[PDB]
Amino acid sequence: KPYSSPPTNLRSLRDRLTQVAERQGVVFGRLQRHVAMIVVAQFAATLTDDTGAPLLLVKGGSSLELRRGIPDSRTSKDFATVARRDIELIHEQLADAGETGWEGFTAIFTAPEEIDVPGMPVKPRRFTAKLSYRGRAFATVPIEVSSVEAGNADQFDTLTSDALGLVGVPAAVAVPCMTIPWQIAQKLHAVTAVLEEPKVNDRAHDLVDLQLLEGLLLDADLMPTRSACIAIFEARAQHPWPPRVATLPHWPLIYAGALEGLDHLELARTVDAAAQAVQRFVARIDRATK
Ligand SMILES: [Mg+2]
Ligand SMILES: [Mg+2]
Ligand SMILES: [Mg+2]
Ligand SMILES: [Mg+2]
Ligand SMILES: [Mg+2]
Ligand SMILES: [Mg+2]
Ligand SMILES: [Mg+2]
Ligand SMILES: [Mg+2]
Ligand SMILES: [Mg+2]
Ligand SMILES: [Mg+2]
Ligand SMILES: [Mg+2]
Ligand SMILES: [Mg+2]
Ligand SMILES: [Mg+2]
Ligand SMILES: [Mg+2]
Ligand SMILES: [Mg+2]
Secondary structure (H helix, E strand, O other): OOOOOOOOOHHHHHHHHHHHHHHOOOOHHHHHHHHHHHHHHHHHHOOEOOOOOEOEEEEHHHHHHHHHOOOOOOOOOOEEEEEOOOHHHHHHHHHHHHHHOEOOEEEEEOOOEEOOOOOOOOOOEEEEEEEEEOOEEEEEEEEEEEEOOOOOOOOOEEEEEOHHHHOOOOOOEEEEEOOHHHHHHHHHHHHOOOOOOOOOOOOOHHHHHHHHHHHHOOHHHHHHHHHHHHHHHHHHOOOOOOOOOOOOOOHHHHHHHHHOOOOOOOOOOOHHHHHHHHHHHHHHHHHOOO
C-alpha cells in the first residue's frame, strides 16, 4: 500500500507521482514541481556555517507552500532564498551537494545571473537546478538567491514535507525558512513598490500571500513585524513606511488568478477587498509600536 522500497528508476518515480497525484487531488504537474522543489530545498538545507546554522533560508511562495501545504497555498514557480554568504560560495556548495546526491537525486546548477534591483547593494541572482533521479533527467527548478537584509536571516523557521515519503523515499525533509515577520516586511515592500514606467508592478499575487501570512502571524509577533517592516523599508530607501496598498488597473484578473484553488479559505475574493484587508493589516502593524 505505501511503498516499502524507493523508486527503482525515473519511470517508477513518475508512475508513483501520478498515483499519489490522483490519490489526493492534485494536478500531476503541481505535485512534480513540489517534489522537485523539496529535493532542491534538501540540498540547500545541507549548507551550514561552521556552527551548523543554515546558510540559505527559503522565502516567498515555496515557503508558504511548505507552511500551509499544497491544498492551502498558491502555486510557486520560484524557489527563492536569502543567503548569508556570497553567491559564488553558495553556488559552489550547492553544486558539490548536488553531485554527491541525496536519496538518488543529483543536480546541476546553472550560472547565477544578476537581476535588476533598485534597493539592493548586492542584487539578487537567478539560476536553475537541473535534477536527475538515478542518472535520468527529472525536472528543472528556477532558483533565486538574494542577500541578507537587516536581521532577516538572524532566525529561521523549520518546515517539513512528507511528499517524498509518499512515493517511498523515507528520508526526513526539514527546510529552514525566513520567519513570518520578515516575509511580511518583504512582501509589503514589494507589493507597494513603484516601478519605473518601462515595466509595471504585476505583484497582485502578493496580496494573496500577505493574507495567508496574516492568518499565520501570532499576535505576540506583531511588534517584531513592525520592527522588521521599518528595517526593510529604511534599508531599501525607496518608498517610506507606512505604505499605501495601491491597486493597478490590470490587477483584478491577476489577483483572481492567484486565488485559483483557494476557495476553501477565507480570503478576499476581489482585489479591492484584498487591498483593504492588507491596508487594515498595515495599520495594525504600524500601531504595534515598541
Ligand atoms: Mg527510467
Ligand atoms: Mg502512490
Ligand atoms: Mg495524478
Ligand atoms: Mg562569503
Ligand atoms: Mg543560469
Ligand atoms: Mg533588524
Ligand atoms: Mg532560529
Ligand atoms: Mg518579496
Ligand atoms: Mg506584538
Ligand atoms: Mg521587536
Ligand atoms: Mg498617494
Ligand atoms: Mg500596492
Ligand atoms: Mg479565481
Ligand atoms: Mg473572480
Ligand atoms: Mg488586521
